[PDB]
């Protein structure tokens, strides 16, 4: 819950990243970085230092699921909490996401309340 926790917000849509960034700020998290897609996210994650990933599901080059699978398979990123944030909510994804090891799942549009809830349960289930 260290409000210093570095978040990587991944979404191919600028406005959405802005919204998420601001919802995090409202919650007290100001250490937020943005990525445009899975590849751009990985390029940035290699630089280490990130403690939480909020990733959109649909993005070009490399979508959310693939990013999650890639993170979970990488020794160094393996334990990175990953919260899927998608507009949809198909049962298949939820299943795939969970199977791949998604730390949580949220349907946009969402409120700081909903986010806070999800972030809390994840910080809890883990240790932060």
């Amino acid at each position: 819950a260290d409000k210093e926790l570095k978040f990587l917000v991944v979404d191919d849509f600028s406005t959405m990243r802005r919204i998420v960034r601001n919802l995090l700020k409202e919650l007290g998290f100001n250490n937020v970085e943005e990525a445009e897609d899975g590849v751009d996210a990985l390029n940035k994650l290699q630089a280490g230092g990130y403690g939480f990933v909020i990733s959109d599901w649909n993005m070009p080059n490399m979508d959310g699921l693939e990013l999650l699978k890639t993170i979970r398979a990488d020794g160094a990123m393996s334990a990175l909490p990953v919260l899927m944030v998608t507009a949809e909510a198909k049962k298949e994804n939820i299943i795939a996401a969970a199977q791949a090891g998604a730390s949580g799942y949220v349907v946009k549009p969402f409120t700081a309340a909903t986010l806070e809830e999800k972030l809390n349960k994840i910080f809890e289930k883990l240790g932060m």
């Binding site: 909510a89 198909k90 969970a98 349907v107 909903t114």
Partner: peptide
């Protein structure tokens, strides 16, 4: 099965 779930249902099959 393209079926949109409620947030409540996502929390039920996720955890």
């Amino acid at each position: 099965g393209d079926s949109i779930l409620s947030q409540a249902e996502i929390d039920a099959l996720l955890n």
